């Protein structure tokens, strides 16, 4: 079951216009990539290559979005004097930093 005509009509009933000639990028902030990223991944089980293709795909979206947002005057860079709530707590970030110290100390004390 693949109703191609039905799915398009389901789309058009709930679709809001995304056109560069009609709406600004600050309205929608979505970028569609040129490549299909399946060509970048030959094997799904290759964890390093598959994660690099996903990292790469969102990297052009960040570059394309930043160029478009700076053109329209929307602020992008977080100032150094903006302290606000984050998705991960400072307590969680502390355990991330202490974990990084542990592997860094273990690698160098191995060489010692």
């Amino acid at each position: 079951i693949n109703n191609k005509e039905g799915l398009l009509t389901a789309l058009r009933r709930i679709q809001l216009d995304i056109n560069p000639k009609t709406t600004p990028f600050s309205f929608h902030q979505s970028v569609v990539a040129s490549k299909r990223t399946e060509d970048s991944i030959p094997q799904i089980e290759d964890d390093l290559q598959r994660e690099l293709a996903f990292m790469n795909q969102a990297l052009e979206a960040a570059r394309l979005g930043r160029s478009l947002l700076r053109k329209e005057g929307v602020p992008f860079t977080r100032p150094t004097d903006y302290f606000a709530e984050m998705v991960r707590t400072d307590a969680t970030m502390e355990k991330v930093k202490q974990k990084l110290i542990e592997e860094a100390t273990a690698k160098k004390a191995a060489a010692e």
């Binding site: 860079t77 100032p79 150094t80 984050m86 400072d90 970030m93 930093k97 990084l100 110290i101 860094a104």
Partner: peptide
Amino acid sequence: ELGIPQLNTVTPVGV
């Protein structure tokens, strides 16, 4: 001395 990356906290990392 250790090569520890900077982590984004309520205190921002900045550039």
